[PDB]
Write a protein that binds this ligand. Structure first.
Ligand SMILES: *[C@H](CO)[C@H](O)[C@H](O)[C@@H](O)CS(=O)(=O)O
Ligand SMILES: *[C@H](CO)[C@H](O)[C@H](O)[C@@H](O)CS(=O)(=O)O
Ligand SMILES: *[C@H](CO)[C@H](O)[C@H](O)[C@@H](O)CS(=O)(=O)O
Ligand SMILES: *[C@H](CO)[C@H](O)[C@H](O)[C@@H](O)CS(=O)(=O)O
Ligand SMILES: *[C@H](CO)[C@H](O)[C@H](O)[C@@H](O)CS(=O)(=O)O
Ligand SMILES: *[C@H](CO)[C@H](O)[C@H](O)[C@@H](O)CS(=O)(=O)O
Ligand SMILES: *[C@H](CO)[C@H](O)[C@H](O)[C@@H](O)CS(=O)(=O)O
Ligand SMILES: *[C@H](CO)[C@H](O)[C@H](O)[C@@H](O)CS(=O)(=O)O
Lengths: 217, 217, 217, 217, 217, 217, 217, 217
């Protein structure tokens, strides 16, 4: 079970890597905007921070305005040449799935993102995408239930190597739901991971055990 | 999981093969009528388009007026001699199942089509048919629920090699249903496959990510 | 169980009313475009065709470009003054739900349309909308399963009078699904209703009964 | 729970009425052919046999070649004028459902027969048909499972008065299935009803009780 | 919930009536054989023991060799004239169900016994039998599962007044199964009822409570 | 999945073997009576018809009046010496199970027939019977549900080699039920197998495809 | 699946071994009391009857008054020295489980009996008991449902070698329940096994087949 | 299935090890307080009692006031140097999970305790903790249901080596629940284990068997 940090802040990426053993980092144009640093700067820092680190995937989304699979393959080839840890994140669109098939044929790892149905997840798997990111939070915010188990079951039934990254996770119960389904990776913000490791009953027992220790020689 | 294009139009067969990685093509007398070209012409084009292509099955239905298993075996032998990619499509009738058994004994791949029950699907499997096409859409149009899981389970329980091609699919949710069942192949029209790759929430997120990219250096 | 004809063609509305006993008619900007007649013309014809007919709701969508609840209430008040059978169809948006609450307070029947979740369906019910149209087909085309039972159950549990019109229906099995859920109305095109009344086994039995009648004095 | 005798033989109709308390009789063009008597003769006998008997419905199918709802309404009006116990049986076709609506409007009881889906059963219910006959045996002979519970549930959910007559029953377990569903009537041949009343364990116990009676004063 | 004593011994019938509040008594030719007294003697004793007792049904089976419904109605009329508490027990056979219908029409209460299927139970209910006795033990002895819930559900769905007497019960868990189903009456031997009222954990607690009482003033 | 023809008519056994690929033939004293030929004659014909054919089991029931396991072993040894394809069919009785154990010890294949419970099926499996025939139709005719899955599951859980032959099958849906359970063989009459291969929707599609072929060059 | 005869009568042990292929014999102080012979006599007979027979376990319970694990190990060592087929049966008590652990360490096979919960069954399995006998009948007589599946599942999940002997079985349906659960052995009285092999429908079919044989040359 | 004694009393640890075959011992600051001996004394006794014993884990919780992962690693390193059987028990806190990762990297076995959710259990598993103790009793005392199966399933799905120790167990039914889930170890007090081995029906049968033994030679 892999825990990828959904963050573009290197103070949180450094902490989670040294204390929580994160297995990777996913970013989106909104996480880079909230970074406050320019996109190319965030990339240079991520490339140096994990220069030697192997098996540490760093998903980086290309220009979201790209509408042609040829323009996406040219932009994502440049970003991928900046670090061997970088995985080009492409939206699940006609030209994104065409661009993700060309990328995977050239050996550039791709993360087909913005997948909201098991039918949108199967094509990324048929073209050999390294990762497929099915989003949960967004659909829930609009009163929809969250097809995650279907994707895991389909991927397994047809022996697909594509690794599922359940995204838009907002609480540790949604981490439990992804783990109970059999999802390969779960991407979450730093605070979702911290709170998931904490429980009120752990503080209750700690107080009961701290009272006992004191009433003991 | 194989995606066969249920079309007799070579502009859609060429596109789907180069961009969607279709694994085969299924046709019926109605798809050839809608082609606007004569049957033998459509066949010559399909034979040349995929002359060398291997592992690209092209299901072609014989004369639907054929009532004798001897007349079907003579007509389907001629069609099969036109290309090594051609798979003779035979209706699930007494003389069709007798003709499909003789064909399979002579090494001519057969696709027993128009199967609407798991009892009609088991005989094609007992005679070594290469493919069995259980239809879904038709029964649904007449208010019937769609036995697909039963066929998959029976085929698996008795280790049958016949590959199930769920046919008459009209939406990507019916593609999800076939994949969740464990069907080997799903045959669908070009537009059913395009829409199955698209979602409104992908366009919503794309707009949110395009706004962020713009408010970023 | 009400069967509303999802059509803007008066040859199909007249036939379905005299032969199928349709209980109402729903239209959308795309059905009026396919009519080939101007919007106001379609309305004048519908107003005269059912001038006296009572209990025959005719859902008519207002300008889809309207972005303010004040502009929607002014446009839908004018359309509603054209016939007592007309029910203003408003999209499930912030300004649509604000405009549907003002309309319902003035006694103008409203059909809150484009609802794709049970959370989007509950607010229309809390403001006293006459109808709420949850769409099925669209979500299915994008590989999503179709929350219809949840809306029926919620509406029932909280004794809401809003009538549910399952929309975007494409086959008679989806009519069976809405009826099995307990939906009040189902809106479908003329051809979806015709095919739903037909079955191959009815033609099989008819042939067996026609052979018997002939072999009988 | 009503038990209608699916027979055109008056020796079996007379016996079942006096010993099994049958509540009605259903006939089809094939049962009249097997009678060996002309159709009008069978009708005259049925009309006299139950001249006074009230609440004894006798379903009689009109010419199966009738293709127009006007020709069906003229033929079924004549048959209905032969006895007040006669219920015109009409096939679930476009012109049959149009003819069944006109018949029911004139007060002639109709039994919409050859219904093989819950979508084909709902229209007969919307037009006020007295009876709707969903067939089971035929679909089973072709390897299909038998939607009967759906029709019962739909009819109940929407408070329909149409009475469901499960037809083509071949064994007492299928009578148990219809009764467990809540079907109003079950139509079966004389032999299906006799065997349904018998069990091997009743003959076993009878032998054990006959041995005890003998070893007792 | 009624508890009928399945016994022909008046020492056990007297005890169960005064201490367990039995609501009735069922007997079969084998229980009368095991009585050791002649049939007519057992009847005279039962008639006097409960001469005035009202609402105390005493099921008495007629000659098990009777093969004609006319001979059964003559024999059961004589037995029924011996006491107003006597209920003629008739086997679920063609002539038994014909004889049970004639008996019920003359106002003689009948208990259609030896019923081993829900199809054999429905006819007794359609003819107004006072009681129907579905047997459990026999089928279980031959490795069959015991349709009891189906009969209860059918009887309830069709508002039948016939009271179900689950028979051949051998343990209190089978009494629990009949009560959980909703059966009206359960007939069991004296020892099945005694053991059903006892539990090892009641003797365990009694010992714990007897030790406490002793260690208390 | 094996399809054995439950017939004693060699015109139907020859056809089913050459066109349907039947894997064996089962017969009972009633099938031989309906043959119209003497028992020994039917056997001589079956022995010559399949003289060389290997792996073609021909189940033949011994004298049904045999009451001793010694008399059954002497009669079934004689019948088994008439052909190597013959499998002695013995009833599931005390002396039948004793005779089936002696037969199996001498290397004579036995088919323990007339099994109506999973407890009656387990003993045949413990003594190494080659086949066990659980009957379905009979129990259904008496309103009983049909323990078939239990036998399949028990046989599998305890790794038994005995092959289950679901018998008394009357429709292709009961063939689907046996295949869904995992039964090894299904024995059915010639007409049950023919109708199981046919569907009304296959004739509907055939007509739609025959109309298209005609409106095509 | 092993069938052990729960009897201390050697006429029934000899018959069941030669005709039913019993795999072992279980006895309790009550079965030896009902034998009418002294305990040591029953043991001498059982030791000689199966002197050479290998793999024929003969469970023999030690003095039920033994309260110390040391006294049980001394008494059960003596009984075990009388025959290599003897398996010391010890009650599931504190001193019984302590005595069963010492016995199993010395290589004396033990059958921890009187187990009525899955928690009482797990300890016998943790100490390497050869057999654990969970009782069913007793709990049922006191209206309790019968944890048997839990023990089978626990034993399997933790790869325990202890073989489960479902005891206190009273009918063949309880044999079916133990086999459906996956129990290793089932111990039952001679009559429970005989009746489990018999069915009324086997006698019905036998009569139908005996009538056919007679009406045949 | 391992049974660890949740006790700090060496009279109960010695007994359970020699008679119940306990596989380990877990202690908490409250068990050491109830010991009445100083913490270091309890440790010295446990270290000598099991000096040579291998594979006998002795979980010992560090100072519950420790708030830094550096202070926990220094205190738990000292305790671990006292015996090779000692396993440092650390609370599931941010600094506890950081301290448990450092400990496991240095080869010191750790038992991450006070886990009350499957999200708090997954991180201990990702850092290679030897044991994870999910608590049940506490949550139940506050009216919460007890996620134990989820942890077992997650651990299994992702092939984690961490062994689950279900803690705060209060009865043998909660031992059955942990065993039915597939938990590796269950830690319980001495009295929970004794009562789990006892049943009232074992004392009932013992009395029935003691009466029989007496009425026997
Ligand atoms: C990439 C998917 O692999 C992104 O990081 C994703 O957008 C979302 O996970 C998060 S959020 O909605 O922006 O919070
Ligand atoms: C062949 C089956 O393998 C055909 O292509 C099939 O008819 C249907 O898939 C499609 S449709 O109803 O004609 O659309
Ligand atoms: C109104 C809803 O009440 C409309 O008629 C609706 O848009 C859809 O039902 C149909 S479609 O997708 O345009 O076919
Ligand atoms: C009328 C329906 O109400 C008929 O009697 C019906 O056809 C079938 O019930 C019977 S069969 O297939 O002809 O046996
Ligand atoms: C009457 C049914 O109402 C009888 O008493 C019945 O036979 C059985 O209940 C009992 S037994 O098998 O004879 O024990
Ligand atoms: C043998 C079983 O293996 C027989 O052929 C069997 O009796 C039945 O299958 C058929 S029927 O009831 O006689 O139709
Ligand atoms: C031994 C268990 O392995 C005995 O034989 C057991 O007591 C019971 O099986 C039977 S009964 O209750 O005494 O009938
Ligand atoms: C250690 C967990 O592995 C402890 O022994 C634990 O606290 C609890 O099991 C018990 S109690 O609540 O203190 O009884």
């Amino acid at each position: 079970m892999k825990y990828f940090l959904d963050s573009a802040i290197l103070e949180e990426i450094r902490y989670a890597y040294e204390n929580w053993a994160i297995d990777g980092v996913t970013t989106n144009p909104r996480h880079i905007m909230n970074s406050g640093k320019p996109f190319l700067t965030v990339l240079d820092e991520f490339a140096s921070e994990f220069k030697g680190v192997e098996n540490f995937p760093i998903s980086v989304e290309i220009n979201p305005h790209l509408d042609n699979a040829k323009d996406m393959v040219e932009e994502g080839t440049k970003i991928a040449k900046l670090s061997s840890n970088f995985v080009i994140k492409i939206p699940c669109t006609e030209p994104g799935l065409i661009a993700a098939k060309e990328f995977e044929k050239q050996g550039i790892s791709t993360n087909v993102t913005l997948v909201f149905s098991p039918s949108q997840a199967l094509q990324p798997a048929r073209i050999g995408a390294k990762f497929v990111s099915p989003f949960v939070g967004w659909k829930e915010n609009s009163g929809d239930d969250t097809y995650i188990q279907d994707i895991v079951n389909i991927y397994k039934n047809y022996n697909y190597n594509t690794e599922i990254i359940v995204a838009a996770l907002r609480n540790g119960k949604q981490i439990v739901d992804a783990a109970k389904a059999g999802a390969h990776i779960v991407t979450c913000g730093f605070d979702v991971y911290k709170e998931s490791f904490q429980h009120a009953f752990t503080d209750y027992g700690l107080n009961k055990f701290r009272n006992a220790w004191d009433n003991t020689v």
